[PDB]
RNA sequence: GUGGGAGAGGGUGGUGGAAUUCCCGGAGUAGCGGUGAAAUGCGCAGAUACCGGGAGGAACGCCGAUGGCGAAGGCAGCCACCUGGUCCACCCGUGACGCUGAGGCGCGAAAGCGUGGGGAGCAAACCGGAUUAGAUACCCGGGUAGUCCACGCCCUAAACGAUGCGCGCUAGGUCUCUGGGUCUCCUGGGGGCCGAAGCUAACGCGUUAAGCGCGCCGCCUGGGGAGUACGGCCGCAAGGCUGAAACUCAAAGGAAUUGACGGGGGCCCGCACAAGCGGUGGAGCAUGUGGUUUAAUUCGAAGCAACGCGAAGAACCUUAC
């Protein structure tokens, strides 16, 4: 507790999970989720119905801290990212804006294998 | 049916309650083709309803075929690695199918001795939310949205 | 195809040359701080190769972006 | 020569922002990570996700191309300096000063070697986790050389357009990069595409020739043995260049054709699957068969397409044993 009332969600979509962070106007975190946090486990953390439930999770325990409307900002792509925003936006949560801010390098380290065909 | 979209067969009404979704719950009593003794059945129990409910039997079966219908089933389909239970609506017409198949299915499963009575006391026990078809109903129901997780294989 | 209004169209006369002018380097930028490709900015060859090495001298000047998140999505 | 031009051509120094990793601080809590699914791994000594600060290495997103530069290998953030090639215009100067080029000399991707430095990410070997019949692999978690810089070696390659260099000649159309002009268009240099004639085994090539011709260099002469052996030369080494023989084969081979095939693509069918209703597989028995047994158990039928099949009538007969 602390009493917040406006912050940012912050969304970070894998093709194996996806993890809700919520922090104050300042970036400092309040609360998380995932599809860990939830009772998932393998695969299923990736899954866009497990983004929607760590979102949810995340929304509810920033009510608690008395939060009310955030600004989403979304990294990665991944199998669950859109059901993440819309999952906030339905759940008393109002979501100011959403900005997507997924790190890109103007080409720095080598991929993986992996990866690869990229750098 | 790789062809065409295979149109729905149509069923001549009801001899009594004029009604078609009668005669198709006599057909999925029916058996060998013994239509007579199927319908026979269908109205002893029928009339079993009464003196046992002051209401009209037609009222009663329709409701219990209602309560029975799935409004979600799990499917399977294979996605590289194995198959993934995927839930999904039921369509209109598997809803009446499968409602009606379970009846006669769950009736069958009673202890009543005769058949008119178990059609009678499932049509009855179903009416009012409990039963072997309603159980059904409600395990499939259960199997779909327990695989929620899986939802995004739409098809 | 996008069929917008080629940034040299909305727009007149200026030095294809003048890494300060904000005010018009802006405007070959994208939602991001990426430089628009010559489908949008409507230039030339030779235009555009000029304009791309003005825009990343604006950059080193801090007038200019190199990246900027989108809104939306 | 004079005047213009374009360019990731080369070398040296400086420098910018994104990202990864690590370290420090804050805030925050039970997981993160990873896969087909997992596990190894990491995390309550507080990880992941988020914000702020710092260090360091390497590489330059968009622009960016179907583009450009170079003799090739190759060259891509931005700034300055030093420096190569090249194109156009003007017809100004020299006056055949030219082409090619054995040997020589220089350059030459990656890997690799030596000395010293650096080391973020990546990653041979290697250590583990899965997978599999096995899995000294594919997938996952780690990780040393190396990948980076300097200096010195190495000198290879699908070092490719698989097409040596130069010059003259032989329809056009179209796109494009860069220059000049009376600037719908013309004219020069370069990059593509379609094509005249012609060439080609065909595929294809076609003013960017694989056409028609001249000059000079390099190289080929069936396949395996073999890019091996020997010798010589070169290298610190790895190994490079030159490069055979015995023996042996009736071929090896190029392009195109019709098929068949594909754990290639597209479109489409069938009780093919799915949807569904009844059943076989278990029992008893009937019948055919395998097997075994017998003096004989007559013969045939064999996955689908043999097995209540030839047998629409085996007590003798039929009947072949
Ligand atoms: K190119
Ligand atoms: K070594
Ligand atoms: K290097
Ligand atoms: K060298
Ligand atoms: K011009
Ligand atoms: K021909
Ligand atoms: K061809
Ligand atoms: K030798
Ligand atoms: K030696
Ligand atoms: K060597
Ligand atoms: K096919
Ligand atoms: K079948
Ligand atoms: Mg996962
Ligand atoms: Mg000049
Ligand atoms: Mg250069
Ligand atoms: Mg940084
Ligand atoms: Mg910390
Ligand atoms: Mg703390
Ligand atoms: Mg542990
Ligand atoms: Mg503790
Ligand atoms: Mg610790
Ligand atoms: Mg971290
Ligand atoms: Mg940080
Ligand atoms: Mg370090
Ligand atoms: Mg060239
Ligand atoms: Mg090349
Ligand atoms: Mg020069
Ligand atoms: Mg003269
Ligand atoms: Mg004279
Ligand atoms: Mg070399
Ligand atoms: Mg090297
Ligand atoms: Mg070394
Ligand atoms: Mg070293
Ligand atoms: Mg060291
Ligand atoms: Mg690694
Ligand atoms: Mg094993
Ligand atoms: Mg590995
Ligand atoms: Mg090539
Ligand atoms: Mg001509
Ligand atoms: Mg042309
Ligand atoms: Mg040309
Ligand atoms: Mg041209
Ligand atoms: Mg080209
Ligand atoms: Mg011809
Ligand atoms: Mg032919
Ligand atoms: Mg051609
Ligand atoms: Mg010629
Ligand atoms: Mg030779
Ligand atoms: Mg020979
Ligand atoms: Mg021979
Ligand atoms: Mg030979
Ligand atoms: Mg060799
Ligand atoms: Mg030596
Ligand atoms: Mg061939
Ligand atoms: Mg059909
Ligand atoms: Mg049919
Ligand atoms: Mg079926
Ligand atoms: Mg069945
Ligand atoms: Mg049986
Ligand atoms: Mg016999
Ligand atoms: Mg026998
Ligand atoms: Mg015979
Ligand atoms: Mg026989
Ligand atoms: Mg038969
Ligand atoms: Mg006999």
Known sequence: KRQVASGRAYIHASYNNTIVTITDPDGNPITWSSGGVIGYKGSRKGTPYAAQLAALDAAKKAMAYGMQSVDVIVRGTGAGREQAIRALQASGLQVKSIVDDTPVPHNGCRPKKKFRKAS | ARRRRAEVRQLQPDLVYGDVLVTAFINKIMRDGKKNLAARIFYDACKIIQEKTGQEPLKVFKQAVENVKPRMEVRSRRVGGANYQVPMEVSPRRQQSLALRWLVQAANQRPERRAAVRIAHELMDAAEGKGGAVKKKEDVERMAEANRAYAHYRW | ?73
């Open chain 3, 1 to 73: 195809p996008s069929r917008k209004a080629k940034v040299k169209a909305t727009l007149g006369e200026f030095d294809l040359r003048d890494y300060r002018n904000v005010e018009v380097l802006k405007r070959f930028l994208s939602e991001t701080g990426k430089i628009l490709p010559r489908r949008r900015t409507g230039l030339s060859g030779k235009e555009q190769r000029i304009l791309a090495k003005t825009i990343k001298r604006a950059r080193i000047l801090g007038l200019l972006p190199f990246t900027e998140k989108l809104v939306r999505k």
